[PDB]
Symmetry: C3
């Protein structure tokens, strides 16, 4: 149920019909692995099945020593320039710091003695979920101790050698990811947290039923917005913090704004003036205001659900939406940029394509079964994605999205015609309708002086 | 056969001698894996060789269930601001959408019954290559059914346990990549498509012999420009779309433009004016025009072959090349920027290094066996890579490329001297030679008024 | 021992107390793997243990052929616009090129005959460390030749089949990484160089004892700043160059500068003027000057040690530090930007948070156990991280860093009040205090004309 409207007057289009899924907070969980403390590998036997077990214990001990070197380092990692600067893992690292305090590990270790999942209140008072995901201590001590603890080693069966390599592999891969990521990984792989464990962790979290359903049906998105932070390894326990997203805003209207340069079409080369709406990005109603996301990557779309991160957003009054139907409205000052760079390009929207065609550029739209069906004249135009498969601007061939949905072409005079090119400011990168008007007055006043 | 020319007048250099390899389209292929439908693991025997087989089937079924959660989400993912906005996987996703239609899977499944490679015309009419790369259904049903389908399970040999883990591993790794990439991966790994399968897929594609030779000798580049899109999993078939690049433009001349700030060298601190050519990047002749690639990553160089993506390009008239030999030419308006920020830096070209040395900065060029061999005075200068191994600008040490090739130093008066610093605009980021001239006239006219 | 100072006058904060770890050069080492030359797999026996060995040799030969296709391609890969352009792997590639010369491999192969580590002087004269990390030739020829070299193949034990898959796996993973990275990988994984081999390689390098201690305690950072460059594969030897960082500057003072927009707080909407210090980033004393790193990613912090890369830096006079205590100082011209965009945001510093609150925005600071404890008025303010856990600006919730350290609030009149909004330039992106003053004079002079 996605719709789109193109505004010929402002060379821009809005895609409506989306639902919000904004990350507004973080939930920190502590994931543990019970380790076996092995120092000496006591066996002088040259048996082939013992040698393969000795070689896997060396890999095991190498990973332990490798992780111990990571815990000794406190781990870390148009209108985009207007944002702030957050600290993404500031919450998770804070939990990682507490686990270094004395006895804090013993709290975790004792709570995870009978069950593999428990809720622990730390010394500072925060209630974190704790999960023991692997008990290599139990396996090594019950299945491998009678082998490599005496001098007359008992030769294991071939099946145990294979089984130990499987169980040890997860530890090795967790160590591998932390080694090439300085102890902070994102997204969180299935080695840090399996699809079963993650879903189970979501169900046990203190969140609403709407958040549980949302997170469970989009765990791949949950992983891309999660961090895995190596913390400690001591007292036979490896602990790393998993920082999961909290979606405080769900199911509010979202819309995406696409913009393209709007220039004059005079045949004289340098006598053209351009103008581009700069407020392009994702917009989502949020607590009476509008959360605006100017960057491309910060929002991921899954069907009609938009997952965004508020740390890369601005908070604007809802009147910002008035710029779509009336860019000259007196309630909000719509942001634009100006130039004399009349160069051709295209923007692929959710349900169509905007084409800014200028100069000697060949701009067309094609179908697979029939070829060219529309040829654009100079200016800014738009074509729906129904019956159109590709758009061509110069030597560039853009495929359009085949998402189903109705588009609407809103006819209107391109607002660039309302300006006189002799008093038009054309070097404005962070400007607005009013900043241009007041700047034209100053130029127009100095002309009135003559 | 790479050459380079440095232009002292404009503080810029051009590297010629390259050949084009531009991605201009996409080819979509459907890769399938025949799966076995296993529900109940019927065996109450505690045999060690059966237990290892049961543990691998659980991993198998976990990957199947994990993939089923991915298919329920329609998957997605100086002069750089001038480009447009494409939708990279719009073509592949379109094919991924068709595979959800009724019976479309049965078409694929039936065509891949006798052979593992076939050409299928879908319901919409497009002809796509289809490849069955793994038949776990055949392996599980022929090698594993007589084990875990009765209640008196037949204990397999140890060799089958090892063989099943190998064949199941590819499915697990494909699932792993799609889990941490929201169903869209790039580059395409050897798990999605092995070097043998990819080469075979290229040879069977409906393309020219030049494209086949080009793609086969640079498959590592082909992978970096390809996408793997998870599609469907039903009726015992896992299908994912692989989106491969089409190189419509091959073997045309390409050249790379390097630019650096050109400032005045007055000893008074703030009395200096700067000027930098902004049209830097890769240029490739293309269909009578020139494809310009302003960003760094969009083009990858392999020997003398330049692989670029047209979606991140502009289409300029061929006269843009005139800016190199004459920046004041009357046919094309060469783009520049201005500032008063006289700060030192260097640009490592293909066959040398440009040095913009200003103020109290120590700028040198060194050889490993002899140390400093040249000391730069203030201004913009250039040194060939023959006999030079490193360049130093301040506290920064740049190694130069040791690619073989002749360089040419084109003497000329730095054009920054032709301007008077009192009417010089110094806040222009998107400007040109003519925009500066007409702006100097307006400032010069208001001075004539006095 | 980290401290922080906030400057209310300039809406900026400086975090002191850090120690430098600047990458200033590169060390190139050659890592080799002795390969076995296998062509024909002579065995017509259908034994299950032979079949598993034949299947692993095919994977082995596939990786060899895959690597041979990579070596045939010479491999490659606010104030940020002011930097230069280096060539990161120019040093490593230079070594990779020399290994293609005749007999250069024989030098390496002969030197690594008795030991697995040797120092080799190449034909050009450079002394590089060389390390043989895997001898598959020795394993295949001693453990696998009596099997697949006769026609009456001798069936191996099951333990050898498992052992061969382990030793062959490293070669396969090295091949895997080079396939999806065009022969150049970063960071350097434990497959290219294990934690034991890397530490051993560091200890044998011709560097100081301070560099050895620094590199060994932060090998995860060493990996993130290293490259692995596929070179050659011929004469039964696979060789790839590992490019390691050299830290020429260690333990000098470093400090991080945070800045935020400073605007006027008039209730009239568009009558406000803004101003933002643009010199934000990392600063480290370096050889009498100051190395300035304007970008975020180029510096990684581990406790109080800052690892930076000089290739992404500028070299400024030490007087740049005067802008913190006096932005109007006459020795250095402090860089700023101007706008009329009064929009709310926050910057999370090392020990607190700057809040730029304007208009109808709700800006607060909270504690977990008590909720809101401070409400910001319009303007630019600051709050320490002691007793504060989160900051909220609009719909955005920022967690603050809980690093221990003292903060200091330096009271002062916001310098934006000293300007008259009628002659204030508000479109300056690359400007400074003096450029603004001289621009106000020109506007003020034309007003004096009337
Ligand atoms: C569009 O949306 C409404 C509510 O989502 C739904 O009831 C309606 O059926 C949808 N239209 C179509 C054609 O399905
Ligand atoms: C400023 O410009 C606006 C629109 O361009 C106009 O309505 C207004 O009268 C001007 N003001 C002055 C003082 O010229
Ligand atoms: C330079 O190029 C031409 C054509 O590529 C070739 O014939 C010529 O031999 C090359 N020069 C050298 C020195 O090899
Ligand atoms: C504008 O400037 C150009 C070059 O600076 C000059 O040739 C031309 O005569 C000027 N035009 C006017 C009207 O001053
Ligand atoms: C702060 O630093 C100095 C030197 O690093 C150290 O001697 C002092 O003890 C530190 N302060 C505290 C409270 O530890
Ligand atoms: C320029 O401005 C500065 C400060 O704004 C002032 O001290 C100086 O006198 C001015 N110069 C002229 C010529 O007006």
């Amino acid at each position: 149920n996605i719709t789109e409207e193109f505004y010929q007057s402002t060379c821009s289009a809005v895609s409506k019909g989306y639902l919000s899924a904004l990350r507004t907070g973080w939930y920190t969980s502590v994931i543990t692995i019970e380790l076996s403390n092995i120092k000496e590998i006591k066996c002088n036997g040259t048996d082939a099945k013992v040698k393969l077990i000795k070689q896997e214990l060396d890999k095991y001990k190498n990973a332990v020593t490798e992780l111990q070197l990571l815990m000794q380092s406190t781990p870390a990692t148009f209108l985009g320039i207007l944002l702030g600067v957050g600290s993404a893992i500031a919450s998770g690292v804070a939990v990682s710091k507490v686990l270094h305090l004395e006895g804090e590990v013993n709290k975790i270790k004792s709570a995870l003695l009978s069950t593999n999942k428990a809720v622990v209140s730390l010394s500072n008072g925060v209630s974190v979920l704790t999960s023991k995901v692997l008990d290599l201590k139990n396996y090594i001590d019950k299945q491998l101790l009678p082998i490599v603890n005496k001098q007359s080693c008992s030769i294991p069966n071939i099946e145990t050698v294979i089984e130990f390599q499987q169980k040890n592999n997860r530890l090795l891969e967790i160590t591998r990811e932390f080694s090439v990521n300085a102890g902070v990984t994102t997204p969180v792989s299935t080695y840090m947290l399996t699809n079963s464990e993650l879903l189970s962790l979501i169900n046990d979290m203190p969140i609403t039923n709407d958040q549980k359903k949302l997170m469970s049906n989009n765990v791949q998105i949950v992983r891309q917005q999660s961090y895995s932070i190596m913390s400690i390894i001591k007292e036979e326990v490896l602990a790393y913090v998993v920082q999961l997203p909290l979606y405080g805003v769900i199911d509010t209207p979202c819309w995406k704004l696409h913009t393209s340069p709007l220039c004059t079409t005079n045949t004289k080369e340098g006598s053209n003036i351009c103008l581009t709406r700069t407020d392009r990005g994702w917009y989502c109603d949020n607590a009476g205001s509008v959360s605006f996301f100017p960057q491309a990557e910060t929002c991921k779309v899954q069907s009609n659900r938009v997952f965004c991160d508020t740390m890369n957003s601005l908070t604007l009054p809802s009147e910002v939406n008035l710029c779509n139907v009336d860019i000259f409205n007196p309630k909000y000052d719509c942001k634009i940029m100006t130039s004399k760079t009349d160069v051709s390009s295209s923007v692929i929207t959710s349900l169509g394509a905007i084409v800014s065609c200028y100069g000697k550029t060949k701009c067309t739209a094609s179908n697979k079964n029939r070829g060219i069906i529309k040829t654009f004249s100079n200016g800014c135009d738009y074509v729906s994605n129904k019956g159109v498969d590709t758009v061509s601007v110069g030597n560039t061939l853009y495929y359009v999205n085949k998402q189903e949905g109705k588009s609407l072409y809103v006819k209107g005079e391109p607002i660039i015609n309302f300006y006189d090119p002799l008093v038009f400011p054309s070097d404005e990168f962070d400007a607005s309708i009013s900043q241009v008007n007041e700047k034209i007055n100053q130029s127009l006043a100095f002309i009135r002086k003559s």
